Amino acid sequence: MGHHHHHHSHMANGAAGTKVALRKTKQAAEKISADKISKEALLECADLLSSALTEPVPNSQLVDTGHQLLDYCSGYVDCIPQTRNKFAFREAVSKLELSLQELQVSSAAAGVPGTNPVLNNLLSCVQEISDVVQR
Numbered sequence: 001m002g003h004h005h006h007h008h009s010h011m012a013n014g015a016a017g018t019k020v021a022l023r024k025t026k027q028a029a030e031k032i033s034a035d036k037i038s039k040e041a042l043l044e045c046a047d048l049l050s051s052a053l054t055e056p057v058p059n060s061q062l063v064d065t066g067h068q069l070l071d072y073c074s075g076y077v078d079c080i081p082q083t084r085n086k087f088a089f090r091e092a093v094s095k096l097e098l099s100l101q102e103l104q105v106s107s108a109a110a111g112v113p114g115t116n117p118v119l120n121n122l123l124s125c126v127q128e129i130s131d132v133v134q135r
Contacts, residue, residue: 032075033075034071034074034075034076035075037071037072037075037076039076039133041072042069042072042073042076042133043130043133045068045069045072046069046126046129046130047130048065049065049066049069049122049123049126050123050126050127050130052065052066053119053120053122053123053126054123056111056112056113057111058110058111059103059104059107059109059110059111062103062119062122063100063103063104066096066100066122067100069093069096069126069129070093070096070097070100073089073093073096073129074093077089077090077093082135084135085132085133085135088128088132088135089129089132089133091128092125092128092129092132093125093129095121095124095125095128096122096125096126096129099118099121099122099125100122102118103116103118103119103122106118
């Protein structure tokens with residue numbers, strides 16, 4: 001216990017733009033985290049959403065948990081050989097990002113189950129994304 005510096009998990013976040021430089025392009029698949037994005041890993045991350053959209057949780061948790069799927073998808077999508085699936089994957093991700101960004105500003109309730117139809121729209125997108133990989 002401690003009543004002086006009372007802050008749990010306070011990571012020293014301090015990088016004013018410095019960490020944003022050559023992320024515009026690539027460098028080497030070995031170092032690129034996107035090359036590490038595994039098929040099963042993406043499915044498991046999506047499973048967090050399907051669960052989180054059926055269990056009552058705060059808006060922050062919903063958006064932040066789904067927010068990672070965008071990085072996984074944006075990197076993994078180009079690896080998909082079948083262009084049909086790759087396109088169906090693109091649209092699903094496009095639906096996911098729009099739904100997530102509107103959910104955070106349309107929170108209002110913040111922590112109320114079923115509060116916004118957007119939650120079901122997210123679920124629809126997650127089902128599509130996983131199913132595209134299962135095609």
